Design a protein around this ligand. Structure first.
Ligand SMILES: O=C(NCC(=O)N1CCCC1)Nc1ccc2cnccc2c1
Ligand SMILES: O=C(NCC(=O)N1CCCC1)Nc1ccc2cnccc2c1
Lengths: 300, 300
């Protein structure tokens, strides 16, 4: 419960990327009014204060906000940071506009249970003309996976369970997207971007999208799953730009990777251009067409 | 969602203990009427049929029951096993009494989110005079732990978080019992039984209990936590008795161990008899007194 804010703090890629962005681009914060959407323990608000913010407003609907209040006092920042409990859609801020919005809002596969809707609400209601929102740029990518042993573990497993048939269970496990760190040696294609978001110009409408994709296969193997992940960019007006990836070739983060199991694994050859289609609909669902099968997946 | 029934099936200590109990004591099942409380995928009901049950009634409130129905048909057991959807407290069984109750009902630390209340309800309402309930005997034990590095990781961690004070968070993390597999080398006492349950004679009233305990310290060290676990016995009328432990000296199970962190670690010496008191109250709470401090813990 508090453990989960602790896990996010201990995700060094996450927390240090935000730290570095803020501390190495103080001109973005100096004498500015900052809104921290979903502030949690208030760590991002404290970075922003340290980087010279004139005022920081930290908003969170959760009980964690009472901890944040005590945390702000312990660090003698109450003259700079004001915490407000509630949803961004409901609270009264003590200003009309802010100069900068910062938020750690990202869900699994970027969009599952994300706080992006709220951040966009904040942008449209509270962001000053010429203001900025960070991180400003996000992408989502897909990558092909070959792991016949894991497929066997999840699927063929059900043909004989302590001597009994359980085949019908395959159809219940296939639709459940898995959140897990992948062994990077199991990747069998180059990644393919399926979505680019700039938070300055994106609407809630753009978060439901469709994309044709082509996976450039790099190993002759059996394709058993498709994995997804996202990359986060701090770019606008930065002298020191910051990027982090949640992909399997990079240091693991608490977002891990998202895995969509294929009911029917199929063979691919190195150098092949494997084409498919992906659509995300509003909890989200992900519909995948590949090798002439189509499956919709959810994250329960 | 279905993944979780899968995890329980893949817990070999769990599932094979029940398998072995049932298959190696067929006289308990032969021509009997069996009730499987919280049957899940129906695996225990199928064991019981294979061991010669005349009729098996499998009850579960969850959606999993529809899978169990198809699973029973795939194995051509519908002439022996009848599945019924609902709570045991609400359903209509097509008999008045059963000869044998079987259930996998156990929660973390035995009692957190357990199905025991339901199993006891079933015993009192449906069990024939002279019938039996399995597993019939359960115990709970405590053991002392020394892990100064992990304590530092959970507690001292909060004194400086990316340069900021967060000490107040210590009081939010201390009350959260942790479910996790312990390195057995960190155990610094012999275990102490704090509770013995026989399911034939236990009432719901006995599940809230108090126990004085004495931990026989085996290593001069800093005590940083108290761990708990449980053992499960199949005994009554068995020619082949079966026991499994969920303790840290045994093969890990999905119940792992439950850890109660001490806010203030204290020194102990090998050979010392460390005395305390533990009380479980109705989601459960666990109140622990040790070294003249008292803390109540929950599993959120
Ligand atoms: O706390 C433990 N694991 C849970 C954990 O690291 N998190 C981080 C995020 C929230 C939950 N695990 C032990 C395990 C044993 C311990 C023994 N002595 C003191 C402390 C101990 C802690
Ligand atoms: O399914 C995966 N992990 C989750 C899991 O084992 N459980 C068990 C209980 C319910 C959830 N993990 C992969 C990971 C990669 C995979 C690649 N190809 C096929 C299948 C793959 C499966």
């Amino acid at each position: 419960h508090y453990g989960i804010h602790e896990e996010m703090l201990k995700d060094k890629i996450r927390t240090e990327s935000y730290r570095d962005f803020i501390y190495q681009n103080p001109h973005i914060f100096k004498d500015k009014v900052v809104l921290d959407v979903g502030c949690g323990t208030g760590i991002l608000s404290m970075f922003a204060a340290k980087a010279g913010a004139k005022k920081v407003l930290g908003v969170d609907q959760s009980e964690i906000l009472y901890q944040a209040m005590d945390i702000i006092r312990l660090n003698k920042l109450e003259d700079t940071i004001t915490l407000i409990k509630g949803k961004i859609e409901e609270v009264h801020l003590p200003v009309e506009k802010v100069d900068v919005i910062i938020s750690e809002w990202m869900g699994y596969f970027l969009l599952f249970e994300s706080m992006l809707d709220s951040v966009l609400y904040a942008k449209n209601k509270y962001l000053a003309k010429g203001g900025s929102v960070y991180p400003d740029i996000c992408t989502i990518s897909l990558v092909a996976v070959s792991d016949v042993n894991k497929h066997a573990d999840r699927i063929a497993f059900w043909d004989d369970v302590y001597g009994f048939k359980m085949s019908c269970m395959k159809k219940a496990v296939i639709p459940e997207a898995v959140v897990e760190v992948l062994d990077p040696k199991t990747l069998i294609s180059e990644p393919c971007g399926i979505k680019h978001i700039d938070c300055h110009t994106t609407s809630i409408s753009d978060l439901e999208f469709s994309s044709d994709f082509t996976l450039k296969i790099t190993r002759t193997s059996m394709c058993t799953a498709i994995a997804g992940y996202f990359d986060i960019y701090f770019e606008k007006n930065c002298h020191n730009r910051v990027v982090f990836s949640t992909g399997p070739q990079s240091t693991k983060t608490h977002w891990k990777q998202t895995v969509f199991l294929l009911e029917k694994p199929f063979s691919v050859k190195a150098g092949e251009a494997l084409k498919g289609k992906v659509t995300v609909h509003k909890s989200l669902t992900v519909t995948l067409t590949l090798n002439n099968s189509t499956q919709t997946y959810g994250l329960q």
